Structure 1
Amino acid sequence: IVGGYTCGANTVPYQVSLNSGYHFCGGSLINSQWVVSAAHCYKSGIQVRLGEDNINVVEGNEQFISASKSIVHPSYNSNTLNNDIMLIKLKSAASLNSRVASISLPTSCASAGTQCLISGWGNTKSSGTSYPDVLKCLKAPILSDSSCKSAYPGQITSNMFCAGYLEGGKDSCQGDSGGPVVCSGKLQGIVSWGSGCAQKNKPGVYTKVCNYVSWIKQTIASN
């Protein structure tokens, strides 16, 4: 997260860190045994780390639970990142508490201008690299589809939306991938892609979760 702020320990209790020996992606806990992340976060041997703030320090609120199953979206296209969404089932149910909480799925999409909370342990530098140990947060509005598609001509699908600031300076970044974009208490976005980070006219691109709710619920119900 570039241009964001320290969330504060466990203030984003649905934020998970996906770990395969190191943090490599965010995810969002959607119920006690399911995390949603970006399909581009897919790998085998994922451990989901719940209740994290400092991902480098055991602070006492963590639950580390291995993934039992990863389900990448049937239509995920890694070339275009269309349908950049994946479900990860936990081997055992997270113990839900103040610090480890699920985030509700949308029952509909969100409008441009809606303010969202984007969070993650991704790079905090627009130029160069600095990875935070504590969770970073960014409030960002959903951008118009036109501004999104203008920013990334030929690349934005109905399954993506942009959020952030065309002026630059505030964005998600690498390492935030798969993490949540929560707007009005709903997971509306997943950190998916963009160009650089927090660059002018290159806003973050997010998986449009509202398109996937049926798939998510059906998949979870059947798995």
Structure 2
Amino acid sequence: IVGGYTCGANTVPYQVSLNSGYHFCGGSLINSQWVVSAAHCYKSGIQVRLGEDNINVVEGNEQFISASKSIVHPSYNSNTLNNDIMLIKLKSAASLNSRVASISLPTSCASAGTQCLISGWGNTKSSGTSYPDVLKCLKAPILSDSSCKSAYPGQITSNMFCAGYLEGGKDSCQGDSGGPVVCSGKLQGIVSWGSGCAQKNKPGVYTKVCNYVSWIKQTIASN
């Protein structure tokens, strides 16, 4: 997250870190045994880390649970990033408490202008690299479709939305992918892609979760 703030320990209780020897992507806990992340984060050897603040220090609220199954969206296209969503099942149920909690799936899609909270452990610099130990946060509005398409000609599908600031300076970044965009207490987005980070006229692009609620629910119901 570039241009954000330190969230505060365990203030984003649905945020998970996906670990394969190190943090490589975010995710969101959606029930005691399932995480939703970005398909482009798929790999083998995933340990889900819940209850994290500093990802390099055991601070006492963590739960580390291996994945038993990962399910990339049936229509994910890695070249366009269309349908950039996956589900990860935990080998055992997380213990839910105030610091480790699921996030609601949306009942309806969100509108341009709505404020969201975007969070992650990704790079905090738009030129160069500095990766934080503690969770970072950014409040950002959803941008209109039309301005998203104008920023990224030929690249925005109906499964994507932009959020952030056309002036630049505030955005998600590498290492934030897969993490949450929460608006009005609902998971409306997944950190997906952008051109650089925090550049003028290049806001972040997010997977539009409301389009996937049916698939998420029926996948969970049979897996």
Under TM normalisation by the shorter chain, which class is it? over 0.9
What is the CA–CA distance in structure 2 between the aligned matches of 1:137 and 1:221, rounded to whole Å? Answer: 32
**Partners of 2:66 and 2:189 in 1: how far apart?**
24
Q: Does 1:50 align with 2:50?
A: yes
Structure 1 residue 205, shift from structure 2 partner: 0.2
Any idea what SS the aligned residue of 1:213 has?
Answer: helix
Q: In the TM superposition, what is the alpha-carbon distance from 1:137 to its structure 2 partner?
A: 0.2
Distance 1:139 1:6 in 2: 12
Tell me how far 1:199 sits from its aligned partner: 0.4
- Report how far residue 87 of structure 1 moved: 0.2
Deviation readout 1:112-171 (Å, 9 max, x if unpaired)? 000000000000001110000000000000000011111111100000000000000000
Question: Secondary structure of 2:67's partner?
Answer: strand
Question: What is the alpha-carbon distance in structure 1 between the residues aligned to residue 43 and residue 61 of structure 2?
Answer: 25
1:30 is displaced (CA, Å) by: 0.2
Q: CA deviation at 1:14?
A: 0.1
Helix, strand or coil for the counterpart of 1:212? helix
* Secondary structure class of the residue paired with 1:57: coil
Provide the TM-score with structure 1 as the length reference: 1.00
- For residues 195 and 69 of structure 1, the distance between their equivalents in structure 2, rounded to whole angstroms, comes to 31
The 5-angstrom pairing of residues 1-223 of structure 1 reads 1-223=1-223
Structure 2 length as normaliser, TM-score?
A: 1.00
Extract structure 1 runs of 4+ deviating beyond 4 A.
none
Unaligned runs of 5+ in 2: none
Query: 1:92 & 1:150 partners in 2: Cα distance?
Result: 44
CA distances 1:70-108 after superposition (whole Å, capped 9, x unpaired): 000000000000000000000000110111000000011
- 1:47-85 CA deviation, whole Å, 9 max, x = no partner? 000000000110000000000000000000000000000
1:190 positional shift: 0.2
SS, match of residue 221 in structure 1: helix
Q: CA RMSD in A?
A: 0.4
Cα distance in 1 between the residues matched to 2:124 and 2:173 = 7
**How many residues were matched structurally?**
223
- Aligned equivalents of 1:127 and 1:22: distance in 2? 23
Q: Distance in 1 between matches of 2:214 and 2:45?
A: 27
